[PDB]
Design a protein around this ligand. Sequence first.
Ligand SMILES: FC(F)(F)c1ccc2[nH]c([C@H]3CCNC3)nc2c1
Ligand code: NA
Lengths: 301, 301
Amino acid sequence: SGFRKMAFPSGKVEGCMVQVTCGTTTLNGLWLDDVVYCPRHVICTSEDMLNPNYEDLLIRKSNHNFLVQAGNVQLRVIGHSMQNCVLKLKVDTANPKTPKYKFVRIQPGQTFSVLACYNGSPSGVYQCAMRPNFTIKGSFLNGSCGSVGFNIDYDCVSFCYMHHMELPTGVHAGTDLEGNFYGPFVDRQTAQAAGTDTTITVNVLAWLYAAVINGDRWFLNRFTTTLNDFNLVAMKYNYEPLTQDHVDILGPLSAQTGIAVLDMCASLKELLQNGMNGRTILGSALLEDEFTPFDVVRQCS
Amino acid sequence: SGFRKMAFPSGKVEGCMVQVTCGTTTLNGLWLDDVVYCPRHVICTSEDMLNPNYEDLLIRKSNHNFLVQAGNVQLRVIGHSMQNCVLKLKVDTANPKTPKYKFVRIQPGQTFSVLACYNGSPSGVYQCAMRPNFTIKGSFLNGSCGSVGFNIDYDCVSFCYMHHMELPTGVHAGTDLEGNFYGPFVDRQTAQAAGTDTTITVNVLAWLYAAVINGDRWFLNRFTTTLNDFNLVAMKYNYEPLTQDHVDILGPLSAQTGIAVLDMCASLKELLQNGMNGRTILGSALLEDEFTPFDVVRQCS
Ligand SMILES: FC(F)(F)c1ccc2[nH]c([C@H]3CCNC3)nc2c1
Ligand code: NA
């Protein structure tokens, strides 16, 4: 029994974190085979970031400008190239700890584990969800840039995130490992802001299922509803629309507990309308939306 | 910015999890040097759980009755000795992945990371606190016994918890790595129940300080309280007595934010009386008690 926000074991990814220093600025890099991946804004000074030409700034730099440290060992940069907003540093030595891995781009609403680091040193891991507004509510201090998010499926680490910046709201923005930003953001010191967030409905339902599995059943009721009526509710309460795919994805949970998705949607409907009436669900007074249906199934099986 | 329940990077513990089989029972073990540590109830059969005589069951076991499997490699057991409620199996091969480690018994209120494991294979990592009633609110399915809790202070892993069982209220009980249970629990399947839980007051206060540090001040007020008046009120909300030790421990967070400990105590007193009137603190709708003063300082600073 029990339900916790739960991250993938971070060992496979810890063995890929390196320190990358360029000039005064120093952040984290991901070392895979013989390449170190890190944010391209490592090559910028405070004035550069105001309006950077990265192609122009990068051609000025050369291999020797990048100090790359893998713990106490130094790594020698033999090549540097840019892909989108990540900088790729060719090193002389391949990482003997390279795991089986893929670069994947995730969808808003999907979850991943973040290995937050400082000076190429892993310090903590936590579970995140890519918000619908393409930010993540992480925990990052100065020095975290280049920290990565990932999922593990079988033996394979799926790298999906690299931390680039904090936004003025205190949330965070980054790219996939191919350097494509998540969300309408640019690696530049300008006025950037998170758009209005919404709640990940399928995830809230999944967590209500996780609640029922764990013995929290007070919010269940005799009613059922339809996608159309519910999405009217969802839209009213700043929840993402529920699609037919979401309902399919929630299939296993609806069978394992006997609560149909539209049946559970009636529960969430009443929760959205009348509130929680002083009670909690899985120890929370908020409707938790950072658990995917897969997350619920994997932790409850 | 951001405040998340952050676990420690689990890689150093992952390299220690093995599978221990005895008869038909398989659970997890911790492989450090040439010793595998696991719950002694692995040697219990169906008819044993009520009143097992562990010395009697163990005197009957040979070394080859213990199957220890480290990944695909089978470890050969060369001895076995029971220490309190943990079995210590001598294996012929030292763990090459053995980190810097030490065994510490923790006090209620302390936090640690849990690496949930099944079949000697790590499943997830999450952060926990030792509740005042000496249970923890974990996430454990059948097969996770021998999963361990730990902190990592400067590359040294301090093992502090081994999972042994789940009490009927859905919470969990275990031992330190010397096999001494936390709280009045025994590794017998007779009815035993956790004491009434309370809220870890010193932790809530640290987390309130964390909220000020991340720029949230709405819950402060102009009042103070004596220590004793605070405790007279907090007892009535099922909060842990706050001691001078707790007040001293918060001293650095008081000085960092400019708010005297007893002033923050007045704030909490009012929070308990008012609720939150629809606001949140660091994103939760309840007062969080699973961040320690040490945790707050290490995640914020
Ligand atoms: F938005 C963004 F791209 F993430 C960003 C914004 C400001 C930055 N300042 C720097 C270094 C040089 C001066 N301080 C560190 N890197 C930055 C990156
Ligand atoms: Na219903």
